[PDB]
């Protein structure tokens, strides 16, 4: 008897660094300390091709980017760069214990946070 922590579509790179290309995927963060992701919805519904990453000893971080804090918690930061322009690129990575790294790009700005918090949350619960 578990409860979904975040289940929706996610973008997944499919090419290279110089030439990025994310495809429509389907991820489901469950309260069972497990992160699953399939090629698409037909995969989740029908249950075909659905990779799972243990949330016992996993890490979550952005693709080499500064701390995502658009809201800003006020206070002299280390380097409040970006004033007129902003990439606003919301993408997080899920690192497993075997090096396996699931890089996804949240379709929604708020969703990316829930997910990152869902993955870290599942890890915090499994750690304790």
Swiss-Prot record:
Tissue specificity annotation: Isoform 1 is brain-specific. Isoform 2 is ubiquitously expressed, with highest levels in brain and heart.
Domain of life: Eukaryota
Phosphoserine PTM positions: 77, 79
Assembly, per entry: Isoform 1 interacts with EPB41L1, PLCG1, NF2, HOMER1 and HOMER2. Isoform 2 interacts with activated AKT1 in the presence of guanine nucleotides, and with the AP-1 complex.
Family: Belongs to the centaurin gamma-like family.
Free-text domain note: G domain binds GTP and has GTPase activity.
Function recorded in the entry: GTPase-activating protein (GAP) for ARF1 and ARF5, which also shows strong GTPase activity. Isoform 1 participates in the prevention of neuronal apoptosis by enhancing PI3 kinase activity. It aids the coupling of metabotropic glutamate receptor 1 (GRM1) to cytoplasmic PI3 kinase by interacting with Homer scaffolding proteins, and also seems to mediate anti-apoptotic effects of NGF by activating nuclear PI3 kinase. Isoform 2 does not stimulate PI3 kinase but may protect cells from apoptosis by stimulating Akt.
Protein name per the record: Arf-GAP with GTPase, ANK repeat and PH domain-containing protein 2
Species of the source: Homo sapiens (Human)
């Amino acid at each position: 008897r578990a409860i979904p922590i975040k289940q929706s579509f996610l973008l997944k790179r499919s090419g290279n660094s110089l030439n990025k290309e994310w495809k429509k995927k389907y991820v489901t963060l469950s309260s069972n300390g497990f992160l699953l992701y399939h090629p698409s919805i037909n995969d989740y519904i029908h249950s075909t091709h659905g990779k799972e990453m243990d949330l016992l000893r996993t890490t979550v971080k952005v693709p080499g980017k500064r701390p995502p804090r658009a809201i800003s918690a006020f206070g002299p930061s280390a380097s409040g760069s970006a004033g007129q322009a902003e990439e606003e690129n919301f993408e997080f990575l899920i690192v497993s214990s075997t090096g396996q790294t699931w890089h996804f790009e949240a379709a929604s700005f708020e969703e990316r946070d829930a997910w990152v918090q869902a993955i870290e949350s599942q890890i915090l619960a499994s750690l304790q």
